[PDB]
Amino acid sequence: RGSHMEDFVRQCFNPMIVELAEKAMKEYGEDPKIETNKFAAICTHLEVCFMYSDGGSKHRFEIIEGRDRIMAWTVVNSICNTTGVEKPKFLPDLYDYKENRFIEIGVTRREVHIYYLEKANKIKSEKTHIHIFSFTGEEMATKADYTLDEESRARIKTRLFTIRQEMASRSLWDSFRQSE
Amino acid sequence: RGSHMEDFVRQCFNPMIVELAEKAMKEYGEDPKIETNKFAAICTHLEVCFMYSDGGSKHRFEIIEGRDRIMAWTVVNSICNTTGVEKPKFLPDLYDYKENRFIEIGVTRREVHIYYLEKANKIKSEKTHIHIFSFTGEEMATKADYTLDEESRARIKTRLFTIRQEMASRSLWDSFRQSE
Amino acid sequence: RGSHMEDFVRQCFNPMIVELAEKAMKEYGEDPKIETNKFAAICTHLEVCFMYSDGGSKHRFEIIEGRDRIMAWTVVNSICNTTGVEKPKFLPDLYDYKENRFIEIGVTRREVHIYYLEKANKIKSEKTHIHIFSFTGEEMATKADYTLDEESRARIKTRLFTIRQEMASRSLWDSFRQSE
Amino acid sequence: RGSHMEDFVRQCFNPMIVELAEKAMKEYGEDPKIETNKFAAICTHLEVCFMYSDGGSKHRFEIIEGRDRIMAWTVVNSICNTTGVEKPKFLPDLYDYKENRFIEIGVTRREVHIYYLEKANKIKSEKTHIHIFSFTGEEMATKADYTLDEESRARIKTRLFTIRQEMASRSLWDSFRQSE
Amino acid sequence: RGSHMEDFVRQCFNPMIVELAEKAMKEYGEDPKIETNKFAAICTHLEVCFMYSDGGSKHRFEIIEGRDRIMAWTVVNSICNTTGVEKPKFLPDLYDYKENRFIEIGVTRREVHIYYLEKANKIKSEKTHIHIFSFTGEEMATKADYTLDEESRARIKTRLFTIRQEMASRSLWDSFRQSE
Amino acid sequence: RGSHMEDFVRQCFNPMIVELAEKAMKEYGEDPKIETNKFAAICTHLEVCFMYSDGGSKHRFEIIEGRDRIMAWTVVNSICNTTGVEKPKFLPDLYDYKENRFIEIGVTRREVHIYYLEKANKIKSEKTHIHIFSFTGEEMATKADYTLDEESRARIKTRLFTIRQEMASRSLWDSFRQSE
Amino acid sequence: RGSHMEDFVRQCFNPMIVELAEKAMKEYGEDPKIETNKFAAICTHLEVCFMYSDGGSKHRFEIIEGRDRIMAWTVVNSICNTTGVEKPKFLPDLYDYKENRFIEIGVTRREVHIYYLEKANKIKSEKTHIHIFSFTGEEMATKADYTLDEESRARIKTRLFTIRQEMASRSLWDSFRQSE
Amino acid sequence: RGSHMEDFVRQCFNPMIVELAEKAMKEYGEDPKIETNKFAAICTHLEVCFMYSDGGSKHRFEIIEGRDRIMAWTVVNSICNTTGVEKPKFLPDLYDYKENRFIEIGVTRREVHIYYLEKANKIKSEKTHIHIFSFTGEEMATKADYTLDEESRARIKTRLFTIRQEMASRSLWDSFRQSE
Ligand SMILES: [Mn+2]
Ligand SMILES: [Mn+2]
Ligand SMILES: [Mn+2]
Ligand SMILES: [Mn+2]
Ligand SMILES: [Mn+2]
Ligand SMILES: [Mn+2]
Ligand SMILES: [Mn+2]
Ligand SMILES: [Mn+2]
Ligand SMILES: [Mn+2]
Ligand SMILES: [Mn+2]
Ligand SMILES: [Mn+2]
Ligand SMILES: [Mn+2]
Ligand SMILES: [Mn+2]
Ligand SMILES: [Mn+2]
Ligand SMILES: [Mn+2]
Ligand SMILES: [Mn+2]
């Protein structure tokens, strides 16, 4: 099928992220060789989730994203049945053992304003925290509480803009921006 | 002999925990292929001990559990002969170099209330600290002093409930609960 | 979902075989947590293919099985366009650079007689070689030409009978035999 | 307990051999810290078995020794049920896929004459091949058929004499010789 | 600069080949980000050289290609000053210790006829052997002496056609063919 | 060409530093076999940059030095487009996510006074921080703000003096000092 | 030569410590196969030095012990020429970048009182800090300043008593105690 | 001390050869930092011995060189006490299990004629085989029996001439040639 996107994705993200993105995609009946924009996004969203969890303290976060659907919900339940938080309706990306809340991480090519309202209206889980980033460098978190310190968040932002430049250097960014 | 428990134990715990559990069992004349509930427990108790020691600071804990009987007592003695704590009658699981006390870690399928009294009456070592967890998510430590911060203990609790769900998903939990 | 088969499969085959079997299954819309007999088979068929290719000389075989559909056909075509053999209708498992032919490897719980006729009638590619094994220890190859020497084939047979005993030790063999 | 033998055994054999010897010993209710001569022997017998299997061609031997009792018999049965050799009464050490026979490897501190008769009278399996070595450098195989070529057997002999010198250098050989 | 070729090259060849190709290119004042066809070729020519040397016996070939200019000539000289072959004017790719000759390996997108005459007229070293391959599957060696056995050469040919299909699947083959 | 410097450089710095220095040199049309003093310097400057970034907290610094020109500027831009700092005219060595500034690291064989003025006059980027070290042990940073704590800086200084002694032990220091 | 000590030393300390101890011994014309008590001591003193440096913060200590004589003095000089501390007459074991002083670590089988006076009278370097430990569990540091926190020092003490028990379990302790 | 030779030796031979050469030198009271020509030779002689043993079949040679004096003689004795060859007076470099003889490998900067007579007159062990090489490319073995096939010996010769060129490129060869 031979997509420039697909070769760029494989040279741009580390193999562990690429393998994991393929699982979720196939597990949801999507094709990384055909749905190449979504493939690029899932990797990106995956790497952000991973840097995010790296920002905290040793035992701070439980990583929900990157597991398979059944096991992701298994840990979700174990978390709810031991802390007592309400079981979310939709799969979150993380759990903060420090603040005792679930995190939903979104990565957008539009206004951080737009995505967040979209995610807040779908959630209505109240307790679940929302933290979104954009490819231009803005972030936006519930109650203005950004969980991590500035430097951990600054790096994520830097990485997201590197991915943008690399995508645009290959004339792929325009098509990627119109994907979301 | 072919026990569902035994295959689940080997897929659920990491190889280092499984090897170590087998040593202790054989070293005490028990068979992991036949005593599969106890095999599952020893692994679990082993993993809890290991996460527990991971919760502290770099040099905080000496790990007694997981060594062979003779060497476990050797370090126990070295600890007593250098700090001056009373030599316990029964093998503890850890030593806290911060609070200067031995830790006994128990993992229960009953009320944290029941196990602790059972362990306190057998101990009578006074100095030795007791910290027990349950598979439903409660903990219970001497003098309400839980040694680790909440997040390290929360993770242990989460893991213990994942093991429960996985065991029950395979219809093994009922037999495991009636083992203790 | 918790299948004894599924835990046995993961403890019985090496991780590389299990990962690869899952790809092919998901890539063909099958579930290893639900289609556990087929999961066990695909692993077995995979390990046989791998030992088989290990039997020859250094550069003897090209391994078609275990690649993804698109790439498996890519090498198939490269092989046909460089040797000149007829392009098979169905994906083979190997290519013999020594005898210059494609190999179809089957693994059966029935008479080696039955499977081979089934595979010969579906093939009709004439050139493609067929080599089947059973779980009881018989083999059966086109033109009585068994490609490998006796010892390489003897080991495959031994392994196949170990898998049978292990499956039956866990009361899984009866259900597995009725799967084919 | 502190045995010179036990420290010498651990410095003289590689960790994989030492771990494996401990399994078999514990699995048969023997103590390597107390039965140190037998501990030294089992390691030696283990290393000989391993070099022996290394002497053949790639797929020549199946290694029975070093597995646990139940799994060693499992492969034994798979071998018998696929070749058709008679199932031995006693666990052999190897299987020769080339000559299609089981091998019993013995290592002696007495006359190769004595041990072999002892092993032949106990066996009576007829088909099972016997190949014994001594610490002084002699060997002795059924039907004068020594399976491996001279060089592979010469190395085993050399190693066995190195172990003797090292043991005697530490004044352990005399007690070891009187063990058998 | 963002070349589809360049991303495909990095996903198609192993990292060791890509690193080595970059050295030679930079060492000769060429840019892999700009001269992407030549970048793709040098990798290909590199991988062929490496499989080629893998075809012989253990100590058969000395690999000249892939070293830096100064060190490649150093070994060339050591080879000439110890065997007595004439020192080539141009850097060869290999040395055959079996046939005692230097090998020049070429990889072409034109007729194996054309490239070979081009390489023979430039060489005039007489002793130096020439062995060329094409992307369609033909080979062509001096004195019809192809050095390796058929299977080693068949694999090279297969790989070369896989690279062609992958390049064309991405609409890169047409531009690559017009590069040579 | 055989330079004592070049052999000393390869035995004195770790392979990762040596490889990276060669890239930058070749990427700028310099020869490490001929420009051996500059080769020694680039390694040194590289190791200082690396220890420097190791001094901070986990996510403190982004390392600009050691990347290739195009990618170094890519991250530079991502940093500027996400924080809003002015885009430097010249490539810096690091970015401090804590103090939000770019760092220029210089290593001198002259007065820390001289180099700094030279670097300040060329920079005029105002925002970019300057931190220089000498081989005799002095440092010198903008606004007397030395970013790292004393111990991290003390180690760099120690290492720089070890390199001096080693160079002089080989009678290479005099020529190296006259290089700058 | 075959010393029980020598086999115990090799099973008791990790290979890196044993290799390093042998260097220093040979570099000073001592034989670990003959001077086995001193061999045991140098390992012990080495492991203490290593745990000690592990107690501090990331960049706290420079490790002098374990290097070869010439290189140990090279770093010593670099440290003196960059901080300005007086160059010790005798090789210390460490440097504290936090407190800016050299550390001499001694390990004794006598009264911590005796060794320290012996080391203080030989030193007279004033600035160099002295910190000694005993095999019974006492420590003793200059100005009652023990550099590390209690837990790091407690572990060293525990380890030292384990080595004592292991040595005595093998009837080697009595001869070791009379060595010092 | 800083010898160009010593830096060249460390960049020219692999770390395992350099470590091993240092052992033998220190074990014989020689200094690689001062006796740099002998240091270069011992490495060279070591690498030749290692390639030599690599030339044979899997179990062909026992490597005597590179062990410590006591252990080298231990294997020598084990070889003699199991084959029955005469115990050499001087330590050989190898044992050929194929031809049943000890090998003395010499590497010369003079006529292969001179060295061999020197080694034959000192030996007088009759049975011990002698095989010498020169840096110009000639070899010379007892009874014109060169043990290995031409290609294995050709590579050794090539390597020896590379070392010569590298040494001379650094103006070290002249001093090295006058060392022998
Ligand atoms: Mn998600
Ligand atoms: Mn999300
Ligand atoms: Mn316990
Ligand atoms: Mn417990
Ligand atoms: Mn197939
Ligand atoms: Mn098939
Ligand atoms: Mn046996
Ligand atoms: Mn036996
Ligand atoms: Mn070339
Ligand atoms: Mn070529
Ligand atoms: Mn720079
Ligand atoms: Mn700089
Ligand atoms: Mn010291
Ligand atoms: Mn000291
Ligand atoms: Mn020698
Ligand atoms: Mn010699």
Short mmCIF file of C-alpha atoms and ligand atoms in Angstrom, two decimals, chain B residues 45 49 65 91-93 104-105, ligand 3:
data_model
loop_
_atom_site.label_atom_id
_atom_site.label_comp_id
_atom_site.label_asym_id
_atom_site.label_seq_id
_atom_site.Cartn_x
_atom_site.Cartn_y
_atom_site.Cartn_z
CA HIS B 45 3.07 -12.79 49.09
CA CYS B 49 7.07 -8.06 49.68
CA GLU B 65 11.83 -13.08 52.22
CA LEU B 91 11.40 -15.30 60.20
CA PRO B 92 10.17 -11.81 59.29
CA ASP B 93 9.80 -10.57 55.73
CA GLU B 104 5.89 -9.20 58.87
CA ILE B 105 3.83 -8.94 55.68
MN MN I 3 8.11 -14.54 55.24
#
